[PDB]
């Protein structure tokens, strides 16, 4: 009865729309971006890992991060008031509470923001192919920052919210999971990479097929934000490409759906792949190759080559990257080429 | 007649030829057919190629133990370097094959045709009276194919380096490049990623929004696609209803409403961004590598405190060390 | 033309051809169910439950039949390795059999319901149009569900009337099928206490019976029926798919 | 389309604005400058001061090794730091 009085208030066309969804989207979103910005400049990753992760410590924009919690923590939620932190905020900061805090708040923040796309769309009366499209990123973040770790030993192995702290997550994958050799990541790429091509070939086709509807050169104005005739010529375009690549669009409605399917689909396959690496169910090797190379020492393919790189990445990295393991690899063990 | 040449020049320039062979195309056509044909054979059958300088031949072809994912056309030898090794410079095909002759033939040709392909992407526009610049958007990929196949080697001193024509050897080029240039830590690559990552992001947006504002012109039991007709008069969706929503998602002015201004931002973002990565590979080709923060954040006594930049480097060493295991005789990798 | 990815839309308002469809899916999943069983029985080696237990042999369905009580074969061997015991009919072969038969009946029933799709009981008496009262529909099903849920915990898991469940020791050295006793204490919420698996299906079963009648009796607030577009069968699909993926994420974790 | 509420272009240009903010902005700037300057930040976020990573020797990192008794562990870690 007042529900409405409220609904009315929330759905008021303000500068920054709000909505019921906003009662979730903003409490979290901010609270997450906030924690990052905090941890990034103030809190450390010394008791958790063993590195300086903030500005106050000496790190720069590239080398800072809100690094995951100690491995001994497990998959613990790390609630400020839980068994671990025991209510003490500062320690909470030291054990790595700021990570599950960002992870979880950001999580509900992406749930919130999608509901929004779904709330604003229902109101303004348009199809929801933008909350659907946004499922793609939910998949990525929900599988890379949540599922993956839940499959391993602790949270310690999830990306860490940092620029370099990610490049590390990249190499680790190449080194232990041999990701680049996974068909699912491959599709992932084929989609992000080709989604970029669509987002750039279409942009250029439109701009260089424009009818003249102005007098000057800066033809940006020639476009009446108001309805009517198409602004470029789909007919001319379809012609260009078809004679300069054999195939060419000719259904703006299909062109724009493809543009939604390509990049979205690829990030989905990208996800399924990682859901697999959570169980170390990777695509590490091709047995047919191994059996051959074991028997015949003169067989070498760019495949085998890369596998040695991995051995190296693990041997030299593991030690400082997995402190809770107390690894100790005597110089005589470290696999190495010649000279180097 | 009217002198065939006069006529020839008219066919070559036909504005209505299924596929527009142009003046540029007169080269693109044979060049790409030489490359494409040699590649396809090389990839199926072709002896192991002594890629590095030593005599440890790598086999990339299918008939020699590979599958589509591992196979590749291997780079001409290191003993060859930057020297021009065409077929006539070999004492026999076998020599040509063992030393990697196929690679040079294939890349010099692909780079030549892919360039004219860029030129062709202008000629046709002209012949069709349309605005140019499409060919300038395509200069990003080309620039990247140029970097990786020609610039990078001219810098390093040999085509033995420089991405090999094959799925897995492409991963090789990368995993090593990192260890040698710490690329992930180079501004130009990050802009490359913002471009490629961004590009996709917007491709989904544009494609998303538009699809979300198509004007009802079909039943429930028939494709939404039929609602459009090739060449149809006016627009096929409400560019105002579109902005009506997107504007409200973030906030009005944090949105588009000008198809021309919106579509340009689509072709400029990824192109400008991808150009950079090409400029990164082309830059790191002369050894101006990525950022280096190893042993910064040192503490009060002098103990090194290690930042993520170091775990990185730690994994980079592992790469640096094992790569090309039998090709080094001295301490520093200056090649 | 209807797109290929929509072909199955022709059922959004044909409760007969929908039930016919749904009858065929079930029938197939049973087929597969017993089907798998037989394949595994035709290749499972029972000769050594110490170093060559079912899980080493890539057994997927066999373990599920073990957990609930089916632990032997008409071939005289036991999954625990017991000298000539004797399942009733309910041996791995029996279970597989039952299923192969069920999928047979379901198949046939799936035809009857396809031909005879226009059944009075399917159309709104007030109109001449077909229609399904989902709210009462649900309440009836949830009633049965809970009724059955209760039964499973009460009689099966308890051994009150049926076998028990696979219960073992801390180090999987002595596992077997024993009857479990409910446990309402708080420990019954410990994922490792079988008694919790019993108490749950007994409580949630009753709580499921009660809730059913409710929906069987109480109608949906005007406001909500509008909100969650009830009456539109496709709102039930989104609601189930949401729970089915919830159930999933939970079985994957456990 | 529908353009509502107090505009920015104007507000930024408003003399009242700078009257108000040519106090607030630097206020915040100096307020936070002291947060670090005082060394308060350190203590709030258990972040080590350049002279507090390892006590003179212990080339070993103070790594939390177990939840539940995690805190007590960190405490003694600072203890040893003398």
């Amino acid at each position: 009865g007042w529900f409405d009085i409220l609904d009315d208030w929330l759905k008021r066309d303000r500068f920054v729309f709000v909505g019921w969804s906003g009662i979730l989207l903003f409490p979290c979103a901010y609270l997450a971006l906030g924690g990052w910005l905090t941890g990034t400049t103030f809190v450390t990753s010394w008791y958790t890992h063993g590195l300086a992760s903030s500005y106050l410590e000496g790190c720069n924009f590239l080398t800072v991060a809100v690094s995951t919690p100690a491995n001994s923590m497990g998959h613990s939620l790390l609630l400020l008031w839980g068994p671990e932190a025991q209510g003490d905020f500062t320690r909470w900061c030291q054990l790595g509470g700021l990570w599950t805090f960002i992870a979880l708040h950001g999580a509900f923040g992406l749930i919130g923001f999608m509901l929004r796309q779904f709330e604003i769309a229902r109101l303004v009366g348009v199809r929801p192919y933008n909350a659907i499209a946004f499922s793609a990123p939910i998949a990525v973040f929900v599988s890379v920052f949540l599922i993956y770790p839940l499959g391993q030993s602790s949270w310690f192995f999830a990306p860490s919210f940092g620029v370099a702290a990610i490049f590390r997550f990249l190499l680790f994958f190449q080194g232990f999971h041999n990701w680049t050799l996974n068909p699912f990541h491959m599709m992932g790429v084929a989609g992000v990479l080709g989604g970029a091509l669509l987002c750039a070939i279409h942009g250029a086709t439109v701009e260089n097929t424009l009818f003249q509807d102005g007098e000057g050169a800066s033809t940006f104005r020639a476009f009446n934000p108001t309805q009517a005739e198409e602004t470029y010529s789909m007919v001319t375009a379809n012609r260009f490409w078809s004679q300069i690549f054999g195939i060419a669009f000719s259904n703006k409605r299909w062109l724009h759906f493809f543009m939604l399917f390509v990049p979205v689909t690829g990030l989905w396959m990208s996800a399924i792949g990682v859901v697999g690496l959570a169980l170390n169910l990777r695509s590490y090797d091709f047995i047919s190759q191994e059996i051959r190379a074991a028997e015949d020492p003169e067989f070498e393919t760019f495949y085998t080559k890369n596998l040695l790189l991995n051995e190296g990445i693990r041997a030299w990295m593991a030690p400082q990257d997995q402190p809770h393991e107390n690894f100790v690899f005597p110089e005589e063990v470290l696999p190495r080429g010649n000279a180097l | 007649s009217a002198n065939l040449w006069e006529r020839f020049c008219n066919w070559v320039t036909s504005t209505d030829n299924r596929l527009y062979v142009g003046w540029f195309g007169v080269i693109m056509i044979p060049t790409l057919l030489a490359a494409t044909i040699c590649f396809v054979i090389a990839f199926i059958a072709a002896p192991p190629v002594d890629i590095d300088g030593i005599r440890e031949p790598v086999s990339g072809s299918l008939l020699y133990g590979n599958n589509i994912i591992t196979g590749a056309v291997v780079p001409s030898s290191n003993a060859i370097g930057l020297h021009f090794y065409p077929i006539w410079e070999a004492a026999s095909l076998d020599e040509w094959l063992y030393n990697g002759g196929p690679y040079q033939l294939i890349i010099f040709h692909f780079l030549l045709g892919a360039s004219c392909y860029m030129g062709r992407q202008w000629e046709l526009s002209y012949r069709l009276g349309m605005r140019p610049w499409i060919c300038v958007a395509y200069s990003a990929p080309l620039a990247s194919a140029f970097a990786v196949f020609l610039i990078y080697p001219i810098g390093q001193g040999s085509f033995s380096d420089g991405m090999p024509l094959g799925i897995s050897g492409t991963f090789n080029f990368m995993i090593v490049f990192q260890a040698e240039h710490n690329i992930l830590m180079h501004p130009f690559h990050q802009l490359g990623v913002a471009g490629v990552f961004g590009g996709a992001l917007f491709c989904a947006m544009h494609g998303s929004l538009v699809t979300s504002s198509l004007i009802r012109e079909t039943t429930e039991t028939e494709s939404a696609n039929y609602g459009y007709k090739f060449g149809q008069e006016e627009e096929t969706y409400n560019i105002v209803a579109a902005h009506g929503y997107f504007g409200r998602l973030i906030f009005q002015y944090a949105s588009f409403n000008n198809s021309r201004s919106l579509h340009f931002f689509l072709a400029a973002w990824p192109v400008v961004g991808v150009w950079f990565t090409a400029l990164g590979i082309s830059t790191m080709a002369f050894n101006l590598n990525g950022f280096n923060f190893n042993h910064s954040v040192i503490d009060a006594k002098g103990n090194v405190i290690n930042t993520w930049a170091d775990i990185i480097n730690r994994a980079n060493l592992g790469m640096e060390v094992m790569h090309e295991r039998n090709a080094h005789n001295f301490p520093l990798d200056l090649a | 033309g209807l797109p290929w990815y929509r072909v199955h839309t022709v059922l959004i308002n044909d409760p007969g051809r929908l039930i016919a469809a749904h009858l065929m899916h079930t029938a197939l999943v049973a087929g597969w169910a017993g089907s798998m069983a037989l394949y595994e029985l035709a290749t499972f080696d029972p000769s050594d439950p110490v170093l060559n237990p079912m899980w080493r042999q890539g057994m997927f369905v066999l373990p599920f039949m073990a957990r609930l009580g089916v632990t032997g074969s008409w071939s005289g061997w036991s999954i625990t390795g017991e000298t000539g015991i004797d399942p009733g009919f309910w041996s791995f072969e029996g279970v597989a059999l039952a299923h192969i038969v069920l999928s047979g009946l379901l198949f046939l029933a799936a035809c009857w319901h396809w031909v005879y799709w226009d059944l009075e009981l399917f159309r709104d008496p007030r109109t001449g149009e077909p229609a399904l009262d989902l709210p009462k529909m649900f309440g009836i099903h949830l009633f049965l569900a809970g009724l059955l849920c209760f039964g499973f915990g009460a009689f099966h898991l308890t051994g009150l009337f049926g076998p028990g469940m696979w219960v073992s020791d801390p180090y999987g050295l002595t596992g077997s099928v024993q009857p479990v006793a409910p446990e309402w204490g708080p420990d019954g919420f410990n994922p490792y206490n079988p008694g919790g698996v019993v108490a749950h299906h007994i409580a949630a079963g009753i709580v499921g019976i009660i809730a059913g009648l409710f929906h069987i009796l109480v109608r949906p607030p005007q406001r909500l029926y509008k909100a969650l577009r009830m009456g539109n069968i496709e709102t039930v699909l989104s609601s189930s798919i949401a729970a089915v993926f919830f159930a999933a994420f939970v079985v994957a974790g456990t | 389309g529908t353009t509502g509420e107090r505009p920015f272009s104007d507000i930024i240009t408003s003399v009242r604005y700078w009257v108000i903010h040519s106090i607030t902005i630097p206020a915040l700037f100096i307020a936070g400058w002291l947060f670090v300057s005082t060394g308060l930040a350190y203590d709030v976020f258990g972040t080590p001061r350049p002279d507090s990573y390892y006590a003179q020797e212990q080339r070993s990192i103070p790594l939390v090794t177990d939840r539940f008794e995690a805190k007590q562990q960190v405490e003694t870690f600072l203890e040893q730091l003398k």
Binding site: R122, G125, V126, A131 | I215, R216, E217 | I241, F245 | -
Partner: peptide, 30 residues
């Protein structure tokens, strides 16, 4: 994870059928 997409799709297709076939031709106040 694949059924989450099913949920978010059919769900959205329920609370949006009135537009499943395109926006209502001719509109304003957006």
């Amino acid at each position: 994870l694949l059924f989450f997409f099913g949920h978010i799709w059919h769900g959205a297709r329920t609370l949006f059928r009135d537009v499943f076939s395109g926006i209502d031709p001719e509109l304003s106040p957006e």
